[PDB]
Design an enzyme around this catalytic site. Sequence first.
Site, mmCIF file in Angstrom:
data_model
loop_
_atom_site.group_PDB
_atom_site.id
_atom_site.type_symbol
_atom_site.label_atom_id
_atom_site.label_comp_id
_atom_site.label_asym_id
_atom_site.label_seq_id
_atom_site.Cartn_x
_atom_site.Cartn_y
_atom_site.Cartn_z
ATOM 1 N NE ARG A 1 -3.585 -0.177 0.098
ATOM 2 C CZ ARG A 1 -4.250 0.086 -1.024
ATOM 3 N NH1 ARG A 1 -4.363 -0.814 -1.990
ATOM 4 N NH2 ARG A 1 -4.808 1.287 -1.178
ATOM 5 C CG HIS B 1 -3.488 -2.820 -10.130
ATOM 6 N ND1 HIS B 1 -3.753 -2.326 -8.872
ATOM 7 C CD2 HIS B 1 -2.328 -2.243 -10.526
ATOM 8 C CE1 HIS B 1 -2.808 -1.469 -8.530
ATOM 9 N NE2 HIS B 1 -1.928 -1.405 -9.514
ATOM 10 C CB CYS C 1 1.539 -1.758 -12.172
ATOM 11 S SG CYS C 1 1.265 -0.835 -13.689
ATOM 12 C CG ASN D 1 -10.535 -4.218 -7.540
ATOM 13 O OD1 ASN D 1 -9.759 -5.138 -7.793
ATOM 14 N ND2 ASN D 1 -10.136 -3.045 -7.002
HETATM 15 MG MG LIG Z 1 -7.809 -6.007 -8.260
HETATM 16 ZN ZN LIG Z 2 0.505 -2.677 -14.859
#
Ligand SMILES: [Mg+2]
Ligand SMILES: [Zn+2]
Lengths: 162, 162
Positions: free
Chosen positions: A60, A97, A104, A118
């Site tokens: 985090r 993500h 990233c 998510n």
């Molecule tokens: Mg995720």
């Molecule tokens: Zn990425």
Amino acid sequence: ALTNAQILAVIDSWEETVGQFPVITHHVPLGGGLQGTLHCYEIPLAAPYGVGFAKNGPTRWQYKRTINQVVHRWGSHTVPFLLEPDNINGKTCTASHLCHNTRCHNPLHLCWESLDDNKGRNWCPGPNGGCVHAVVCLRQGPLYGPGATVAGPQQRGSHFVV
Amino acid sequence: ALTNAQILAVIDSWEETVGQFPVITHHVPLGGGLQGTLHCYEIPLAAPYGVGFAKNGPTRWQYKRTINQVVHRWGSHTVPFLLEPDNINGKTCTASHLCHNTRCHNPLHLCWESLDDNKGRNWCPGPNGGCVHAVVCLRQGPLYGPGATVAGPQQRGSHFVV
DNA sequence: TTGACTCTCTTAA
DNA sequence: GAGAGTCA
DNA sequence: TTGACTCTCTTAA
DNA sequence: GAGAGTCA
Ligand SMILES: [Mg+2]
Ligand SMILES: [Zn+2]
Ligand SMILES: [Mg+2]
Ligand SMILES: [Zn+2]
Ligand SMILES: [Zn+2]
Ligand SMILES: [Zn+2]
């Protein structure tokens, strides 16, 4: 309150800093037996991380800017979405993500959606394997597949019907 | 308890009690535009729940038996799997509802798998929509679908590539 | 104003 | 998705 | 022995 | 997947 111009300036400084993160090329499953390539802009493993960035947990981070003597701080992946609605259907929006690579910070690898949406991307067959996400996945989810179930449905007697 | 005979006796008593739970018919999406029918054996909403059963959380129950003068207690959905390995690949095995109905204790609606496999069934397209689970789903997951993404991947500048 | 740490919290299986 | 303690 | 409550914990987004 | 505090 920060003005829209001030928020745009925060997003621009965030992009300038993240754009200088190491860019790592990853070959990834797309579904349908096809392979693709993603380019992740990865925050460093240890300090220093980049101007404005600090680690608040094992995976985090937060972004911090001081504007007119007031300290403002955001989750490090939330900055691209500061001009977007922050909830939908009564659910908080989360940074999600598409590359499933927590370090990233590439905003082209992020979307902004409920925590359920998510999470669900972890099991998606991928953009070439049957993804139905309206904002399409960039890759097959890392947990897609037959699974590793130890025991299936079963009874010892005759008390039950499916 | 410790002996296989003692374990089988616990499974048998559990099945006999759960077999007297009310049987509730649920019509469910299978994927592929098809619908099916499941028969869930549902623990009561309030005490008394059945011999050996007690509620430890809003939708959590435990089964308990006294064996050799000692109380033995288990999560109420884990009892069918007491002779199975309790881990897989170093991950804890969990009771996983194929009917996605927590009050149901029908062992024909339960499997024993990692928490990740368990969770992932929430998004499965279902047995007539492309489920690839080796232990097959009984229905399309309740969270399958396009999602409600508020914002997709985007950048303001020219620093990023996919 | 900034960096590098610290802490606890949310959700739904 | 779990384990365990307090009372009667 | 059995029932009906109480509490906190695990995981990985 | 999050917010917030301390110290220099
Ligand atoms: Mg995720
Ligand atoms: Zn990425
Ligand atoms: Mg489940
Ligand atoms: Zn998808
Ligand atoms: Zn059921
Ligand atoms: Zn499935």
